[PDB]
Amino acid sequence: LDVNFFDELRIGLATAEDIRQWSYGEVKKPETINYRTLKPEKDGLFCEKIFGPTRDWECYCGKYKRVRFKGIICERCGVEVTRAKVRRERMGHIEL
Amino acid sequence: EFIPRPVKSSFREGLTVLEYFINTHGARKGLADTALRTADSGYLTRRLVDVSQDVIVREHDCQTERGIVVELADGTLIRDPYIETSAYARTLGTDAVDEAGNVIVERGQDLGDPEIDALLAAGITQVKVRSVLTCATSTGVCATCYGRSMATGKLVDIGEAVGIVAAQSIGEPGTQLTMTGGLPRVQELFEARVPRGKAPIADVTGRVRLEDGERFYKITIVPDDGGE
Amino acid sequence: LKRLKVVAAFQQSGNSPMGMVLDAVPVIPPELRPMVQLDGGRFATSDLNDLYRRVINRNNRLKRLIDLGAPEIIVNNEKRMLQESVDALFDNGRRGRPVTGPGNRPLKSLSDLLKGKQGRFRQNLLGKRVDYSGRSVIVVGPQLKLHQCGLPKLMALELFKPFVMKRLVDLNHAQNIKSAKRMVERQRPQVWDVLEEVIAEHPVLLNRAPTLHRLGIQAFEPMLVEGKAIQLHPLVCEAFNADFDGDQMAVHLPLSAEAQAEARILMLSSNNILSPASGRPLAMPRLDMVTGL
Amino acid sequence: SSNNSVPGAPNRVSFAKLREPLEVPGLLDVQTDSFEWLIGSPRWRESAAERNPVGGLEEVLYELSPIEDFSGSMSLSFSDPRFDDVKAPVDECKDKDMTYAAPLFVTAEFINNNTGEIKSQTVFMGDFPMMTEKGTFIINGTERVVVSQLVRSPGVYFDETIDKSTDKTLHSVKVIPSRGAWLEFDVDKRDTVGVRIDRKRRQPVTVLLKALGWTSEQIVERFGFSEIMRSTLEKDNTVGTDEALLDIYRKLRPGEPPTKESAQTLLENLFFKEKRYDLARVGRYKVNKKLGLHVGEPITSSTLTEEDVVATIEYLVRLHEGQTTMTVPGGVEVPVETDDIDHFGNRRLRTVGELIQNQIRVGMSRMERVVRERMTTQDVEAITPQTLINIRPVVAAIKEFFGTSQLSQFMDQNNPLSGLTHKRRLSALGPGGLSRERAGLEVRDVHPSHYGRMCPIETPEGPNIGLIGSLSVYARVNPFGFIETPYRKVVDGVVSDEIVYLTADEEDRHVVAQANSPIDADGRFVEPRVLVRRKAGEVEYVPSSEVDYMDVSPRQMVSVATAMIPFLEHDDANRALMGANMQRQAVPLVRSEAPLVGTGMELRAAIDAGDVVVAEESGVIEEVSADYITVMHDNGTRRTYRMRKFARSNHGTCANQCPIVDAGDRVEAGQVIADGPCTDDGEMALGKNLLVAIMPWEGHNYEDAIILSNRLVEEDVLTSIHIEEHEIDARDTKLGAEEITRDIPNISDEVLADLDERGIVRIGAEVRDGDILVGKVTPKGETELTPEERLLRAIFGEKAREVRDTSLKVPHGESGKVIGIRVFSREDEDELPAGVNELVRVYVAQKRKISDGDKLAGRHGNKGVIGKILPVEDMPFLADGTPVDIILNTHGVPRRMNIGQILETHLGWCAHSGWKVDAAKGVPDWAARLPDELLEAQPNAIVSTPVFDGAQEAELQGLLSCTLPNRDGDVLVDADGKAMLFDGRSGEPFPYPVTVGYMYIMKLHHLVDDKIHARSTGPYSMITQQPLGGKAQFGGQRFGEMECWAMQAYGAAYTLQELLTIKSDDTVGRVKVYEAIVKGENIPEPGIPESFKVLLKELQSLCLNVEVLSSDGAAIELREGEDEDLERAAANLGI
Amino acid sequence: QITDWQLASNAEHSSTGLRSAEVEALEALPDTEIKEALQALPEEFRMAVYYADVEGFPYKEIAEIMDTPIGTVMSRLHRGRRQLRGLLADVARDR
Amino acid sequence: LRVQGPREVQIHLVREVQEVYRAQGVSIHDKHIEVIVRQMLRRVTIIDSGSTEFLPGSLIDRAEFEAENRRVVAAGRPVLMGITKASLATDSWLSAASFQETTRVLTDAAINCRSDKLNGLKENVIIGKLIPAGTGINRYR
RNA sequence: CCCUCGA
DNA sequence: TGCATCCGTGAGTCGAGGGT
DNA sequence: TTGTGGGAGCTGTCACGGATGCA
């Protein structure tokens, strides 16, 4: 928890290196989610591999569905088994 | 623009059809005006809150001797019309001494209602008062220059955010201002704009030569120093 | 001098101007650009996703053209389109036409999300929606004292719900905190005797919009009242510019010792009799009272 | 007096003295005329015969046909539009979320000239939505109105604007058609005349003149008199014809290689080619009367002609000199003047039928694209009128229009008057109209041409003021879309009975007198000198020899709702607008009661509103039940009217029709058979007659508050019925389909006791806050089971799929009786959206009594909320024990300028008590003028005060003398209208006579029950993590910016922080604060607002590297822990 | 902008609702009826049931944590489930 | 301002605003208007930059102008600033961007690597810290 | 966000 | 190069419930 | 993937300051 005593708050221009140092993977596909299964398409704007898991402690394919498995990255999914909260603080990027 | 024919009827008698129709022009013009006027006043209030927000009281007294002189009053003294907003609630800058040696109000008193009454009763016609114009504090203002907190009646407490109270006090009645400007003029001054219809002033003391053409005035000032 | 203001700034602690040209675009986390299913089987997406999708589509089509060794005119067309789609993503409408959604509505870009009275600054940081707050019609209630307000029972019960729950478990009316919750939600008759206990001496803030000055928010001591309306002491009307032709007011419950103390001391109605603009009193007899006296 | 144009209508005796020579037209005619034109109904045709008849559809079809191919070989032409029957009745569409539509067929004839063959066919166009008998539409189940839209008529318009800097008087002209490209001509600061075409740069007008064919000398000959045209031609860049066309094309297409012939083609297509450019018959007539062209009444073609362009250019250059006259080749003495944008001869309205036609046309053209596309890609002998026509774009156009247009609106159905005025509205905004950011103040003003057309009183107080008006009583829209008003023709000084309908245009050429003008019984202007009006709000006295027309009636300027305010002319326009608006917010009460004091307008507004059941034909009542009414005509045929019973309106008010006839009764055509929601025996009854006292009462009616007798609670006189529709669906989700079930997790058998076997609440149950109405469960997933839920499921071996409770509950503060359940299934064949399996609506009815906080008002803008409901024994009472019903504070009346409310009160008393003027030894003087059969009245008589012709002051004072007494011979109200009241609290009499009387009071649809709201804690927005908004969503109040200024000015730092972190945004501090309060300990310290992190993330998304640093200068990590709570979870499971 | 009405409408059919601070707080507070029932069990039984069907470990792992053979962890598990089924009469309040 | 000096401008402006409010029967105490006017006269334009790092023509707060003048051992004449421009030119880029013209303020703050001291109350409001006023002052806190 | 309404 | 033009900035608060 | 083939809207806003660009 942040003690909320920040001295200063500073801007500058981001370098492409900074933009890649923030990113968790490149969004390569325009598709959002399957019209049938309502699940985030891989490499899309809602992909779970880079942005994060939609459901708490659940990977994309279901091989790791528990709080017991925590921190590990599913070698079949590429999805990190953690809280869904991460989907509000993990940026992707796009290589132009 | 006023209609030449007046509504000769009272609402007790009951207006005719044309009187009623005619009355609606102005009725609705005013109802519609109210929305734009309240938006204008609100924008001004937001800008004032922003410009004044960090102004807070920081210390009790900067101990300055600077201030401004306010008038309080051919056979008798006529109370000044503007005592309520410039003299009252100020901190007295210098002792108020009457025609005799009496000390009516001492330097650094509140100038409440009893004090202003005692001042007028003693023939005092001018007083020096502390102001935030003359306040010497680096950041913000000091309590003694600001005077009493209008909300509490006592002298302003050290933490008060008087910028927001000032912006609110100026904005709140802004919707009362109707029709160089009214509320447009308040905005013109606060925005520090070059005013429409600007009256030039003298750059130096001297003599005036006034060339009076047709729709063309030409003023020349010859300085007392003798310069250009 | 104009031109120097830029160069001198780029001439301090690195900060190379290369950052003004981009080879990689950052993509905002997906929670901040939601997509929700609607009644009907249709979806509603934030504009940000359509903008990023146009960027992605055009960048991929440019990749395809570069691979196919397309004519230079066509690849240049695609590069210009990519520039324009990133321009839309960042600040739509700033150059040329804005990317439009249905109804010829310009999609709100990342710049719009920050500007205006709807952007994050004015809409979500300098003011926000709060918990422990209610709203209702106001009625006069002339029997009150200056420091008091009539707070409806069904408002007080909700506003104080966790307090009355703790007390319900304190006095054994409930066995656990979950049953206390169920009790307050079912409005079992035990709660009301407890309610008047917790409400006592706990100040609440009343606000009436538009708040034109600080006296547009004032603290009161709540008296439990019969009915569904807030009773508002008749002498504070002038301060709120409140009449009783349908005005409504908002109730806010301070929680912390500090917030309650600020309410009792700084904001209590009977401590704010004087106008903070003119120094004169405002809680003065106004119309009927005048004709009485 | 009798008002007997309606059969069986109650006897409302009228104080009016002038005679109405004309009757109020069908108040729904504005919509029925329009739609029956669009359709081409038989009725419409007959009307045409009385007056070349084509219908809106026929017009689209003839404009579109014939459809030739690029080679002129094969032609498709649409011939006849016809309609099938309606697919389903109105109530059936409402129940099943359908659209009340009829199938549209057309006759499609395809010709092949190369083979000479002809294939006719009947082609189906789509399910065309239908207007009801009430002038509305049912769209996807809900009832809707298409509001008429105020647009500027096609034409040519000149205005004068002073120059920005130079202070020179500049002139501009806009040629604006009903469809196509705009044209503009503008003179600059410099004296060059310029043409602006579709916002392009201003080329010299000489460029266009030479591109049309006019040579340099041919131009100098005509425009030489104006040294402006000679100056701009000497300043012209190039001189020639095809070079001019070249420059036109160059400026018209940027980044484009110009070509002379394609420039010729494009320019001839833009304005003179009837394909994509059309100013309608309105625009043609407007420009022809504006410039003087074609005065032999030729209406053959409606397109921009070259001669029209030349005439407008010359008009502009001569208006720059401002000469009062002009003449064109063949022109006719044309006045030169600027145009008023707001004058109702230049501002027309597109009604419903035209609004629909304008979308039909778009769909048809999009379909014609596909027709021309199919004609090439298809085998020429294998095609048919069915293979070309794709009706997808037409159906999509109609659907889009009714479903997204600003002008297709949720019908407001508080009461019949609401819907009646809504159908009659004139709205300024919309597509093709003016936009809201361009809504100046002058479009909102009352314009002198609105007289008799748009009511100057009825309009909104808030942001829509002057943008929404309502049509005047006697007004009618002409086929051009202009509003006409009737006038009696005055021949040389006699006022005949010939009625002529004038537009605002034709009105300024004449002069108009008033309905208030004395005349002898034979007919002649016995008034010696008149006070009249002419153009631009003239007001002048004049001899009756110059008066051309006179008003047909007072209230001619007034709308329906406005014409229902007794003593309107005693009320200032502000409170009168308030009264007109608040009538349309009255709620229907359980028992409806017509006003003792009304105008002649109530009855005729109820009938035309439609919520009243009226007999189509004369007959005898064969049967009457609460459920239906059967009349046996003299024909031998029967007719049965089914009663709407406790239907829910769009706004939650109860639409309950009730029969007013008895079995055996004789009824005529046009007689009301059953009352509607706010009707009483055929008349509009929006409120109740209340015994009022005008006096302060102990501050409980301070500052507009109202005091009520508890009688109004006990006798249900201000009780209303309100019906909510709670709807919930079981649909397919990411973890499987939801199920509507009685098996709810974490719920005891007790709380389900009122549900049936399937999980829906049982009909007739009483329901309170949080009661399940429909049990539902949503697939959850094992990771989302709480540790307690996981333990319980393991121990008791529950193999059932893990679900979370997503039941539909009763929302906070709502309660009532379950009136009806309606359910649709996918197992059964029921139209449902995709993925939606089960749908169920529970209807709940609450009987709301009047309460502290409810809003009441009279008809004169006299609004208040209820401050206190006193026991009957506490009210001030009259000398015979009668407690007054409502106490209105005296201080509220005089400064609002509505003593109508007082005058009504007086008349209300008189009508309640009944009177008999002496009339012995002659009729008195005050009664001489009007009263006649008003010389006496029985108690609780029903009287009308027509606006501007009602009960005069002297006659009112006279009735207050001859008031009949009560049952003991006591006169309780003196000749001033005052009475001695006893203080019911103490018993002592009040020291002074108080005005008491009867006043009509309405229960406005602003009730505490709807408005009380409180939230401790609830839902949060996913984007910002701040509380949701709105009562319906259980939201939190917005502590806005000015509120934070208020909090700062106090120096209340901790309150401000707590409001801005733990009460909204701090996602861990929220939980820890609720936890602290529940555990009885001190509230913790705030965290970081989530919205600040959201701001930083948005900035990073803008490539801004915003970091937050510590004292050291090191970036701070803005994230939370993973296992921050491990000890206490074990502690809570007891391990 | 995504409407609050839209957020709530969507929450009506989602595996997890728009949860309130109070719900979270209660979930982070003891479930008294359940905690007392678990504390009634002996240590070995409570630990076996907790490891088995609260944390969901596989039985061999539950063995390796309590260093007892698989059979006796299974014995402790089934018998602690029985004892808790007896101890929890508030299943009827929730079932 | 340039003729009679700053002390006289402040008098002029307070009086000329009070006149508008007086002609409409509105009583504003002078001290509020003076609090606003004071913020219009807090900077000086640099005519000759002398030996300091100030770009000529820039508007510099009188306190920091005189402080950096004292430590360099500089031609500064007072400026009258409108309230909107005195607001957009504050040492807090957060305060400026949240007030008005957000895109421009943020572009400049980026180019200039501006570092917000986070000391104003509004800034403290935005981040969730106790405002430096009233009960949030260290003296009382 | 828009529409209609409320103070 | 000296302005005129064009462009970009801003235009009150909080509520209700119905929609894309 | 082959005779032919340019949208639907729109302005019915206003005041002010300063870069932009133009002769």
Ligand SMILES: [Mg+2]
């Ligand atoms: Mg009010």
Ligand SMILES: [Zn+2]
């Ligand atoms: Zn996986």
Ligand SMILES: [Zn+2]
């Ligand atoms: Zn000082």
